[PDB]
Design a protein around this motif. Sequence first.
Motif, PDB file in Angstrom:
ATOM      1  N   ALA A   1       4.381   5.813 -17.016  1.00 39.01           N
ATOM      2  CA  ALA A   1       3.762   4.543 -17.442  1.00 39.01           C
ATOM      3  C   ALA A   1       4.994   3.727 -17.815  1.00 39.01           C
ATOM      4  CB  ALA A   1       2.765   4.817 -18.529  1.00 39.01           C
TER       5      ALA A   1
ATOM      6  N   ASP B   1      12.695   4.947 -10.984  1.00 39.98           N
ATOM      7  CA  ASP B   1      11.853   5.471  -9.906  1.00 39.98           C
ATOM      8  C   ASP B   1      11.249   6.807 -10.340  1.00 39.98           C
ATOM      9  OD1 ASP B   1      14.291   6.752  -9.875  1.00 39.98           O
ATOM     10  OD2 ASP B   1      14.555   6.654  -7.702  1.00 39.98           O
TER      11      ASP B   1
ATOM     12  N   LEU C   1       0.841  -1.184   0.000  1.00 36.99           N
ATOM     13  CA  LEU C   1       0.000   0.000   0.000  1.00 36.99           C
ATOM     14  C   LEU C   1       0.885   1.245   0.000  1.00 36.99           C
ATOM     15  CD1 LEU C   1      -2.663  -1.240   2.556  1.00 36.99           C
ATOM     16  CD2 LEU C   1      -2.994  -0.955   0.100  1.00 36.99           C
ATOM     17  N   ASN C   2       0.272   2.401   0.245  1.00 42.99           N
ATOM     18  CA  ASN C   2       1.028   3.643   0.306  1.00 42.99           C
ATOM     19  C   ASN C   2       1.817   3.718   1.608  1.00 42.99           C
ATOM     20  OD1 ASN C   2      -1.129   3.765  -1.574  1.00 42.99           O
ATOM     21  ND2 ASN C   2      -0.902   5.995  -1.704  1.00 42.99           N
ATOM     22  N   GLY C   3       3.092   4.085   1.498  1.00 41.33           N
ATOM     23  CA  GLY C   3       3.992   4.111   2.629  1.00 41.33           C
ATOM     24  C   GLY C   3       4.768   2.834   2.867  1.00 41.33           C
TER      25      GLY C   3
ATOM     26  N   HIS D   1      11.362  -2.447  -1.606  1.00 39.43           N
ATOM     27  CA  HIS D   1      10.233  -2.023  -2.420  1.00 39.43           C
ATOM     28  C   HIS D   1      10.385  -0.569  -2.857  1.00 39.43           C
ATOM     29  CE1 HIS D   1       6.338  -1.991  -4.180  1.00 39.43           C
ATOM     30  NE2 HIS D   1       5.795  -1.195  -3.276  1.00 39.43           N
TER      31      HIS D   1
HETATM   32  C1  LIG Z   1       6.227   3.771  -1.975  1.00 38.88           C
HETATM   33  O1  LIG Z   1       5.594   3.881  -0.735  1.00 38.88           O
HETATM   34  C2  LIG Z   1       5.181   3.550  -3.058  1.00 38.88           C
HETATM   35  C3  LIG Z   1       4.613   2.132  -3.015  1.00 38.88           C
HETATM   36  C4  LIG Z   1       3.474   2.049  -4.044  1.00 38.88           C
HETATM   37  C5  LIG Z   1       2.191   2.815  -3.692  1.00 38.88           C
HETATM   38  C6  LIG Z   1       1.047   1.899  -4.115  1.00 38.88           C
HETATM   39  N1  LIG Z   1       1.682   0.601  -4.297  1.00 38.88           N
HETATM   40  C7  LIG Z   1       3.017   0.615  -4.269  1.00 38.88           C
HETATM   41  O2  LIG Z   1       3.762  -0.358  -4.405  1.00 38.88           O
HETATM   42  N2  LIG Z   1       5.796   3.846  -4.342  1.00 38.88           N
HETATM   43  C8  LIG Z   1       5.381   4.867  -5.099  1.00 38.88           C
HETATM   44  O3  LIG Z   1       4.446   5.577  -4.727  1.00 38.88           O
HETATM   45  C9  LIG Z   1       6.059   5.149  -6.447  1.00 38.88           C
HETATM   46  C10 LIG Z   1       6.934   6.402  -6.395  1.00 38.88           C
HETATM   47  C11 LIG Z   1       7.898   6.577  -7.571  1.00 38.88           C
HETATM   48  C12 LIG Z   1       8.726   7.852  -7.400  1.00 38.88           C
HETATM   49  C13 LIG Z   1       8.845   5.380  -7.640  1.00 38.88           C
HETATM   50  N3  LIG Z   1       5.066   5.313  -7.495  1.00 38.88           N
HETATM   51  C14 LIG Z   1       4.181   4.339  -7.747  1.00 38.88           C
HETATM   52  O4  LIG Z   1       4.372   3.186  -7.433  1.00 38.88           O
HETATM   53  O5  LIG Z   1       3.082   4.804  -8.368  1.00 38.88           O
HETATM   54  C15 LIG Z   1       2.340   3.822  -9.123  1.00 38.88           C
HETATM   55  C16 LIG Z   1       2.520   4.061 -10.618  1.00 38.88           C
HETATM   56  C17 LIG Z   1       3.572   4.830 -11.082  1.00 38.88           C
HETATM   57  C18 LIG Z   1       3.723   5.038 -12.444  1.00 38.88           C
HETATM   58  C19 LIG Z   1       2.823   4.473 -13.333  1.00 38.88           C
HETATM   59  C20 LIG Z   1       1.773   3.703 -12.865  1.00 38.88           C
HETATM   60  C21 LIG Z   1       1.622   3.496 -11.505  1.00 38.88           C
END
Ligand SMILES: *[C@H](O)[C@H](C[C@@H]1CCNC1=O)NC(=O)[C@H](CC(C)C)NC(=O)OCc1ccccc1
Lengths: 305, 305
Positions: free
Chosen positions: B191, B187, B141-143, B163
Amino acid sequence: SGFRKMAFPSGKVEGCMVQVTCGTTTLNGLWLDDVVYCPRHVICTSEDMLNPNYEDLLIRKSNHNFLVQAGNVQLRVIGHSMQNCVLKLKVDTANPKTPKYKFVRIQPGQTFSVLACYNGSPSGVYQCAMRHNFTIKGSFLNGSCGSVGFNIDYDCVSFCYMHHMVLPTGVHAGTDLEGNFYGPFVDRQTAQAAGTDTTITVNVLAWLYAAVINGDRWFLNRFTTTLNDFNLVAMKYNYEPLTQDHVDILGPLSAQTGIAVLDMCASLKELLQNGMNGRTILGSALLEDEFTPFDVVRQCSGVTF
Amino acid sequence: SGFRKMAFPSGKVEGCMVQVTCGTTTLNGLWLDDVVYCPRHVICTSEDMLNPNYEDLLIRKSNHNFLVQAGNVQLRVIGHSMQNCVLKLKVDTANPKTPKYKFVRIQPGQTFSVLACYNGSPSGVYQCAMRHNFTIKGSFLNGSCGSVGFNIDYDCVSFCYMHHMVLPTGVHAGTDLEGNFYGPFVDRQTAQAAGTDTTITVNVLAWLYAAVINGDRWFLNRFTTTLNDFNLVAMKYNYEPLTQDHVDILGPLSAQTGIAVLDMCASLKELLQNGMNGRTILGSALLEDEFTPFDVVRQCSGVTF
Ligand SMILES: *[C@H](O)[C@H](C[C@@H]1CCNC1=O)NC(=O)[C@H](CC(C)C)NC(=O)OCc1ccccc1
Ligand SMILES: *[C@H](O)[C@H](C[C@@H]1CCNC1=O)NC(=O)[C@H](CC(C)C)NC(=O)OCc1ccccc1
């Protein structure tokens, strides 16, 4: 989000696992405060387990006949007593790693985490569910008796299960931490039979709500049904009948998803009557019943312990 | 015996989870010795994650801009550095719970245990497998960023995963403890696409040997095949081709069961061409590929840690 079969962190329970030896048999024990808990068939030989008079077998045992090892340290047994099917060995030292704990007897359908141990050392952890016939589908080998099942509520460890034996059908049975067996089983090497195991219906329904949350919706039909009519279909398929209490439990999930409780039962009626047609729900080709409604929200909201 | 999807005891890893805060973002960190490891997107805002110049974003950060909490205690950051996609925060205190640890980069098919955390507190543990396209089907989830994947060899904790993000297809991606991403991912909130995910063939074969051990044998056919002919069938079904190394790994299982390696491939060829016909293997209606050959013997022989 995703959905996996998750178990609680086993950090608090690992510090309470000890090795108990009595004669030629060795199993695991639960060391809380100054009391060590373990199954009573440790005082048995291979010939005793056929048919045992645990009372007569315990008369021939003193405090020094029990070898308790905590890692590389030996605990001095100063007393022993038989409460039902578990021993309570009184040691002279309190466990400095004793957490907030409590003993609880759970009901069928509830889930818990099992810490499989051998020689008092943790080998792994997995999630289990008390089935309808008071059995579980666990992963136990020889020497795994004394492994405990538990739940964690923040910092309180609720111990509910201790392993004892495996049945002819490969399923397992055990007691609570007071020694009372879940089900009609006894600690003997006798052919014993578990009864008919029915599917936890509320667990499958909560699992379907988890599928809608994560995106699986091919099974959402646009039908409705009544409890009396759905239960009559569930009785043909060896499912638990549904009550108003089960509906009230699924309330939060019913409001979060906007899908009525009786509406979801209509989709489950179609899943039973029509099968799955080679599709999957959350990566499984079967209706999964190991997930309580609390297990769904705990994973879909991220509760920490 | 039984067969469940098991994870290692998380006792050693729980003591290494800390909460890391930088501005308005909070994630989990790995506190080993006097170094704290965490993803570098903690120094990002919601608008930064669209497209980030991590170098420029890190210039504007000092040691006091990082809030590290170990339970109810605060660690004083005395240094910071960016190694690939992870931060290395230098704290003034060594972790008194640091175990024997080591960093390792794993290969596709290998399994590990993930300790999902939020605010630095463990929420649960589950088993995962590095898939063919360097993704995993986790529960985040988030966090949850900063949660680590690990293996345990007696008392040594081999950390292999941290993760980072979730993909459009719901699967997850991350780095090793050096910051290098598993796969072609970056990171950023862009998409991104994982490639074609093929089934770990050796993992399914080792899982079938576990089924023969526990009593499921309906799939044992009395046919044989060659590697070149079985691989040509596996290519149509999006399976990993088999090599002599995969055969040598399944050697111990092939000798323990008395079933030849090429004989088991003939049964898998029939399972792919004919389906399953509503039956199950070890309680599953699908071919399961989350189990390495070591995972089978570790559970079928009871190795302790
Ligand atoms: C870190 O806490 C978080 C874990 C995510 C949130 C929901 N499920 C997860 O595994 N990672 C992120 O929020 C990450 C941040 C980037 C700077 C790496 N972004 C992310 O996972 O967003 C989902 C997404 C990003 C791009 C395209 C489609 C979906
Ligand atoms: C305790 O270590 C052990 C765990 C068993 C061994 C294999 N799988 C398990 O879960 N329990 C026993 O060995 C137990 C001893 C009795 C005195 C309770 N007996 C047992 O489980 O044997 C299997 C069996 C007994 C009777 C009929 C059919 C099978």
